[PDB]
Amino acid sequence: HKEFTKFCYEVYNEIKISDKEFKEKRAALDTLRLCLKRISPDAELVAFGSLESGLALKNSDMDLCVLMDSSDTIALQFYEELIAEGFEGAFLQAARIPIIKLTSDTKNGFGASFQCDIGFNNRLAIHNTLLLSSYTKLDARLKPMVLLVKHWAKRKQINSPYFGTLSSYGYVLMVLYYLIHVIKPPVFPNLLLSPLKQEKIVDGFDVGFDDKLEDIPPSQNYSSLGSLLHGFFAFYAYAFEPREKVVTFRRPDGYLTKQEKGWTSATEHTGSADQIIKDRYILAIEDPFEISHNVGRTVSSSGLYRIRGEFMAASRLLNSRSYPIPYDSLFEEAPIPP
């Protein structure tokens, strides 16, 4: 597995975010914080997502949150203040939920490349990010592995939730589930199920986990990055059974069925126009903190087929005995599904 490992680190250096790009995004966060401070002093602007957890690809987008205690006008007023500051953007309202999307920066020196998403009181997203940051700190192998999977999923056109496949966060959870509960010895302990974990309730959910990393013993797993990646691909390709099983972080053995979960069901809720929005559980990934949410709800039968197929193709490629193996095929673009 040594040469594949070499390949992975080489690609990882290519696709990871530069310090320079990281610096510019950081500066942008500061400028945006000033704008919020002028109109609301007590309000806070918080970064989350890939950039905050160090799990970001090149040219990633910022995910930010404006949070406040106890109001309805601040979303629009912020957007207006941002436009006035020379930013270019959109103000979006759907299902009574407001979002701000910045697409360019004309005055402060970030250029037209600048892109940003701002949301309001998304506390759960912040805590999800905190967990991911902890694991990223825990083992050096996690960051390259996650980045490569993200790159792989994007290229194989299985990273489009709106078109039937899986979100980036879902794949990270798949990786994390594999490292904690599948591979032996475990790369990771389960921080949620730790003895030292203390209950913390935010928005009616337990978001608490053991975040005292220095007291956590070193990993008993000494596999190379290439070895972890191959095993991860092979597991979902063959071992994992999506029809009966749930990806979860709430079980010591990581064993949960949809039947016990109650996610065998196809399920419906009504949108703002009272259309039927069906929640599929064809792929079941139970969000670590938001238990009700299925991160995999977006996957469809055609979608799961494509995802599983790429997993098989990846495994077969790495398992292949016809040297020299074409590792670059792993990241070559796939014909886009019509």
Numbering used by the authors: 41 to 110, 114 to 206, 207A, 208 to 381
Give sentences copied directly from the paper behind this entry.
One such TUT family member, Cid1 from Schizosaccharomyces pombe, is a now well-characterized TUT, which was first demonstrated to be localized to the cytoplasm and to possess poly(A) polymerase activity in vitro, but more recently has been shown to possess TUT or poly(U) polymerase activity, in vitro and in vivo. The TUTactivity of Cid1 has been shown to be important in promoting mRNA degradation of polyadenylated and 3′ trimmed transcripts mediated by Lsm1–7 and the exonuclease Dis3l2 (12,13). Cid1 has been extensively characterized both structurally and biochemically, revealing that a single histidine (H336) in the nucleotide recognition motif (NRM) is predominantly responsible for discriminating uracil over other bases via a mechanism that was proposed to involve two alternative conformations of the H336 side chain. We used an RNA-binding-defective mutant of Cid1 (K133A/R137A/R277A/K282A) to improve the resolution of our crystal diffraction for higher resolution studies.
A β-trapdoor structure (residues 310–322) was previously observed bridging the N- and C-terminal domains of Cid1 in a UTP-bound crystal structure and was suggested to play a role in UTP selectivity and enzyme function via substrate containment as part of an induced-fit mechanism. Deployment of the trap door correlated with H336 side chain flipping but its absence from the Apo crystal form and other UTP-bound forms suggested that its stabilization depends on direct contact with the CTD. In addition to the novel structure (crystal form I, space group P1) described in detail above we were able to crystallize the RNA-binding mutant of Cid1 in yet another crystal form (crystal form II, space group P21), which is also an Apo state but this time with an observable β-trapdoor. However in this case the β-trapdoor does not bridge the two domains but instead is stabilized by contacting a crystallographically-related molecule. Normal mode analysis of the model, complete with its β-trap door, demonstrates that this feature is comparatively more flexible than the majority of the CTD. This strongly suggests that the ordering of the trap door which we have observed previously is fundamentally a property of interaction with the NTD and not of NTP binding itself, because it can be mimicked by a crystal contact. We suggest that this enables the trap door to act as a ‘strut’ preventing the collapse of the catalytic cleft when enzyme substrates are bound but before uridylylation has occurred.
